[PDB]
Amino acid sequence: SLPATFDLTPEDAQLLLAANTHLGARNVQVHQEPYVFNARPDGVHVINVGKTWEKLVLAARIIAAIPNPEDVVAISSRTFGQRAVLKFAAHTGATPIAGRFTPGSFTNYITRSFKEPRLVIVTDPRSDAQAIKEASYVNIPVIALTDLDSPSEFVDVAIPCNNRGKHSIGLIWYLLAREVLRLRGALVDRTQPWSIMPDLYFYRDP
C-alpha cells in the first residue's frame, strides 16, 4: 500500500469542492458504478470523493509503470478539455489528440495520425466512443474520466467525475500531472504543494 502522505489533504478537498467534481448525474447513476455518497434533495447524486482520489492515484501509478512516457495518449473531442489535454501533454511525456480523432489512429499505418500507444487516457467515453472502440481492437487499456450516467464499455480504472462544467476536467488532469510528477520525478509530496495554478487549464472564453 501507499504511504499516509499520499492521501486526500484538506486543501485538495477544498479545491475539488470549488470545482464541483463531486456533482454526479441528474437522471441516473448506472449500477455499473457504485460511487455515490447519498443523493441531494431536488437534484443530482453526490460522488464519494475519496474513492475518486484513490482511483486517480491508481491511474497515475499505472501511467508511471509505462516505460516511454510519450506513448500515453490524451483523447479529447470535448472542446472544454482540449487545452487541458494539451497542457497535460506538455507537462508529462504524453502525446495529445485534440479535436477530431480520425479513425484508424490506432488501427493501421499509411495514415500520418497512426500512433501506437501503450496506454490511452480519455476525457469522456460518450463523445469519444470512436476512440475507445478503436482501443478495443489493438490491445490498449483505457482510463476515462467517467460521469455516472455516461457508459462504461472497455474502460479500466474509471475515475468518477463531473464532465459537464469547465472547472472539473482541467482539475482532474492537473491532479494526474501532479501525481505523475510526484511519482518518478522531482517534486516532493508533502513539503511542496506545487505553485502552478489550475487556472492554467480550462477552456477558452472567448
Partner: protein, 220 residues
C-alpha cells in the same frame, strides 16, 4: 523490408524469437513479414478460387475470390480469403492475409499418454454461416476422417488422427473452411483440468524493451 509498428522492429532486431511469445501476450500482427521471420517453414495451399460477378450498367465485374490455407506441420495454421480482379494477385494477397492471421492449436492425446501428441485435446465445434464443423479426438492410426479441404487443412495444421462431423450446406468451401479454422482455434480457448494452476502473468516484450525498440527518428 523497413518495418512499421513496434512488433516489426522487435522481430527485425532479434528480440522476439518464437510466435509462441506473441501468442502469449496476444499482440495483433499487422505486417506479414513478422510471422515469416518467426516461422520459416510455413507453406501455402490454394484450396479454391471461384469467380464472382458484380452486375453493372454495362456488363459484369467478374472479380475472382481465392481461399488460401497456410501452415507448417507443428500446430500453426492460417486461413486467408481475398478477392481481386486478377487471379495471381488474389492468390498472393490471400497468402498474405493467411500469414497475417495464424492461430496456434492445442493438440493432445486421445487417452493414452505416450511420446508426443497426435489428435486434438478436446471436442471443439466451430460454426460459420449454415456450416458447423465438429472436430473430435480420434485414437492412434485413425487418420484424418474429413472431406478433402478440411483434410488438407488438418494435414497442414499438424494433426495426424482426427474425426470430423459437419452439418448444413457444405458445398461452399469458404464457410466450411472458416468454420474449421474457428474450431481448431477454439482448442486453446477451452479450460482443461491440467491448466488449473495459477501462473504469475509474465510481462510483454512490448512492455519490457519499449524504449530500446520504439518508433525511431534520425532525420540525418
Amino acid at each position: 523490408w523497413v518495418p512499421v509498428t513496434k512488433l516489426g522492429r522487435l522481430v527485425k532486431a532479434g528480440k522476439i524469437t518464437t510466435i509462441e511469445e506473441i501468442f502469449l501476450h496476444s499482440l495483433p500482427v499487422k505486417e506479414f513479414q513478422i510471422i515469416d521471420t518467426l516461422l520459416p517453414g510455413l507453406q501455402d495451399e490454394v484450396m479454391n478460387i471461384k469467380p464472382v460477378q458484380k452486375q453493372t450498367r454495362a456488363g459484369q465485374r467478374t472479380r475472382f475470390k481465392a481461399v488460401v490455407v497456410v501452415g507448417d506441420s507443428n500446430g500453426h495454421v492460417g486461413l486467408g480469403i481475398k478477392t481481386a480482379k486478377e487471379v495471381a494477385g488474389a492468390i498472393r494477397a490471400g497468402i498474405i492475409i493467411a500469414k497475417l492471421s495464424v492461430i496456434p492449436i492445442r493438440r493432445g492425446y486421445w487417452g493414452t499418454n505416450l511420446g508426443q501428441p497426435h489428435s486434438l485435446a478436446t471436442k471443439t465445434t466451430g460454426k460459420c454461416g449454415s456450416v458447423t464443423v465438429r472436430l473430435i479426438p480420434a485414437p492412434r492410426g485413425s487418420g484424418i476422417v474429413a472431406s478433402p479441404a478440411v483434410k488438407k487443412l488438418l494435414q497442414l495444421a499438424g494433426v495426424e488422427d482426427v474425426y470430423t462431423q459437419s452439418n448444413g450446406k457444405t458445398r461452399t468451401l469458404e464457410n466450411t473452411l472458416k468454420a474449421a479454422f474457428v474450431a481448431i482455434g477454439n482448442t486453446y480457448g477451452f479450460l482443461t483440468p491440467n491448466l488449473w494452476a495459477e501462473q504469475p502473468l509474465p510481462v510483454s516484450p512490448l512492455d519490457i524493451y519499449s524504449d530500446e525498440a520504439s518508433a525511431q527518428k534520425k532525420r540525418f
